[PDB]
Amino acid sequence: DAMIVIDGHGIIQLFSTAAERLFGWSELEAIGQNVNILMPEPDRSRHDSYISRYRTTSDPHIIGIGRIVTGKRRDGTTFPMHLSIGEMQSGGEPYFTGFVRDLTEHQQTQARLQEL
Ligand code: HEM
Secondary structure (H helix, E strand, O other): OOOOEEEEEEHHHHHHHHHHHOOOOOOOHHHEEEEEOOOOOHHHHHHHHHHHHHHOOOOOOOOOOOOEEEOOOOOEEEEEEEEEEEEEEEOOOOOEEEEEEEEEEHHHHHHHHHHH
């Protein structure tokens, strides 16, 4: 679904059209903001340390692995999403690209079948 590109400081550089629909923020609004605006606490307040931690230790926890986490929309509603992260460099600086897959439907179907 969504594609997001951030610098080594967690600041959003590129925000795809699909991401706009998924998170509710427009491209102009999102750009120049910390990526932590797309997640809820406690991850939100710790995301910078997550990046900092990786930039020094170089031990990936999601990069090359992938993980299912909770995303937070503009209207405050949260949702499950699969997150894949890629590391790249441009202009001698590190950039991270995140590919997001909305799993809202999957989760709803699973809960529904469990309820019946
Ligand atoms: C919107 C929901 C998101 C949540 C809830 C989330 C959550 C997390 C978590 C839990 C970690 C640390 C994992 C651990 O310590 O075990 C992490 C690491 C990281 N996040 Fe996010 N994140 C989200 C989106 C993104 C996006 C869109 C990017 C942008 C490309 C991103 C880039 C990173 C980077 C670079 C790391 C460190 C590299 C690594 O640990 O492999 N995150 N994030």
